[PDB]
Structure 1
Amino acid sequence: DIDLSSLRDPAGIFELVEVVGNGTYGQVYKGRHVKTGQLAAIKVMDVTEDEEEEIKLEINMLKKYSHHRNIATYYGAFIKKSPPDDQLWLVMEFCGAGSITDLVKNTKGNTLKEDWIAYISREILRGLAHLHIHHVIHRDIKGQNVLLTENAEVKLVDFGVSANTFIGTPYWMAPEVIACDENPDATYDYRSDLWSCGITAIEMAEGAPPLCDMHPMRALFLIPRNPPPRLKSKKWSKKFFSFIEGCLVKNYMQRPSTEQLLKHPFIRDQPNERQVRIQLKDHIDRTRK
């Protein structure tokens, strides 16, 4: 429950600073709570035709399901009314260190240490488990939607695709979400996010998802046809290969649940957990340029 009629103007409450990206629909600004100076991420979306119900939906999911440490917390919603085509500001917790895509991009050799991948993946999985118990599928798990705070906390964003008129990036999409001759009605199940989580792990390991060198339309054709993607390097632990294999089961019917993957030795057994939190924290401060 949320009505656009009750929603106040953001003037004096929140102000925009600089653009830090975009979502499914609308630009994402680094915002500031006027009275305290506290940073907040502001999603500014134009309320138009069809988008009126699409943006309204994101508000209800963000409001009700962001009450977990691994999901960026919903603060509030506002409408900066323009002549009778308005602008909606969706305010949530700011994640200072940026996306995990940005992390691997700003790392020597565009790869992260295996124990960093283990920590990040578990945090994605924990946020996913919370959504899945609440009968919610994220539907857009990718490094761009996995953000870090200044204190190396991992948080999930964007309920823009969650269960518009544009098809986004295909590389993190599970085979079953792509419609083809033997799969006409797609078939989104919660396990679709686990495939996406595995592709995000290859992204942390190699700096890019598998098939990144393909035209997006060609990758969309290949994902359901190709065998499960594999890590290029042999350096990785047997536990990491097994985790990737676990996430990337082609047929979602034999793919493990979020709960099963949370018990995977790669996720479950993390002895250097405290040190990687320090290492990661140190790395985000090191990126001072």
Structure 2
Amino acid sequence: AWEIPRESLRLEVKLGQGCFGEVWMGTWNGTTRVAIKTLKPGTMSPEAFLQEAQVMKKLRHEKLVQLYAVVSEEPIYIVTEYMSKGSLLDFLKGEMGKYLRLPQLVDMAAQIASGMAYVERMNYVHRDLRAANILVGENLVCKVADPIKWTAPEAALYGRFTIKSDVWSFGILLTELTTKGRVPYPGMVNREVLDQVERGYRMPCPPECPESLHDLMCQCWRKDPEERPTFEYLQAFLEDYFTSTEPQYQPGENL
């Protein structure tokens, strides 16, 4: 029922490139602006593209990128909604990044937490939550889409991926938001990162970030995955943030 005919799609602008395929901006039925992901025949089993899209047929939330349609026979195409502003990572590092302040950035974290809260309700796991996999639309809409610096130790070392390891990544994602997309653990290589976080090292409070928000990060980074808060809790905390937690907030130079 998701199937659509090939002549209904029009690929216009190439946005990205990979060994598994490409991503384009396009039109569906001449009217609907859309994102279109393609599969490169031979580079991957169709079964793998089909698994992703089967999952996207089961999940539906305003903060998860919506699948609109598919072309299941090779060459495959996956059609979704169009997030005009691209990746959160690019957004934060680029010309728009410089005007974002703490209230905008905490609202972006609340949207992402709301989408992850939904994933949590549905008993799914993301495994790769980070700024590069968050998509930004008009009016600062952020939606979840699709790496040891973002990966909880129990996952990286022992392969124990859970919603709690996603919560760890969310904490790291909070640092990207408050540094304008700077790589976490700056000047540390992966192996140094691994050894340090095992020994208890945790990133410090970013400059101009209230300590209350860095406290939340550290909750997300509790060694014991079951001590980490839920996305339901994180969503509520960030939604209420400027009344319940930092009611005396004052804007500064960067946050």
**TM-score tier (shorter):** 0.7 to 0.9
Matched, 1:116 2:89: no
Q: Is the 8 A contact 2:19 2:43 kept in 1?
A: no
User: CA shift at 1:131, angstroms?
Assistant: 1.1
Matched, 1:250 2:223: yes
Greater share of helix: 2
User: CA shift at 1:152, angstroms?
Assistant: 2.0
- Aligned residue pair count: 242
Match of 1:147, SS?
strand
Q: Is the 8 A contact 1:174 1:223 kept in 2?
A: no
Matched, 1:187 2:160: yes
Matched, 1:269 2:228: no
Q: Is the 8 A contact 1:44 1:87 kept in 2?
A: yes
Q: What TM-score results when the alignment is normalised by the length of structure 2?
A: 0.83
Q: Is the 8 A contact 2:19 2:40 kept in 1?
A: no
Counterpart Cα distance in 2 of 1:127 and 1:175 = 23
- Residues 57, 108 of structure 1: alpha-carbon distance in 2 compared, 3 angstrom cutoff: closer
Map 1:1-289; keep pairs closer than 5 Å.
Answer: 7=3, 10=6, 12-22=7-17, 25-36=20-31, 38-48=32-42, 51-65=45-59, 67-79=60-72, 86-107=74-95, 112-158=100-146, 169-179=147-157, 183=158, 186-206=159-179, 207-216=181-190, 219=193, 222-225=196-199, 227-233=201-207, 235-264=208-237, 266-270=238-242
Give CA deviations for 1:171-218 in whole Å, capped at 9, x if unaligned. 221112112xxx3xx211111111111111111111213235344565
Counterpart Cα distance in 2 of 1:119 and 1:24 = 34
Q: Is the 8 A contact 1:18 1:30 kept in 2?
A: yes
> Which ranges of structure 2 fall in alignment gaps of 5 or more residues?
244-255
Pairwise CA RMSD of aligned residues? Answer: 2.7
Give CA deviations for 1:95-140 in whole Å, capped at 9, x if unaligned. 0011211121114886841112210111011001111111111111
Aligned to 2:247: none
Q: Is the 8 A contact 1:178 1:224 kept in 2?
A: no
User: CA shift at 1:71, angstroms?
Assistant: 0.6
User: CA shift at 1:47, angstroms?
Assistant: 4.7
Q: What TM-score results when the alignment is normalised by the length of structure 1?
A: 0.74
Counterpart Cα distance in 1 of 2:38 and 2:116 = 25
Counterpart Cα distance in 2 of 1:109 and 1:128 = 23
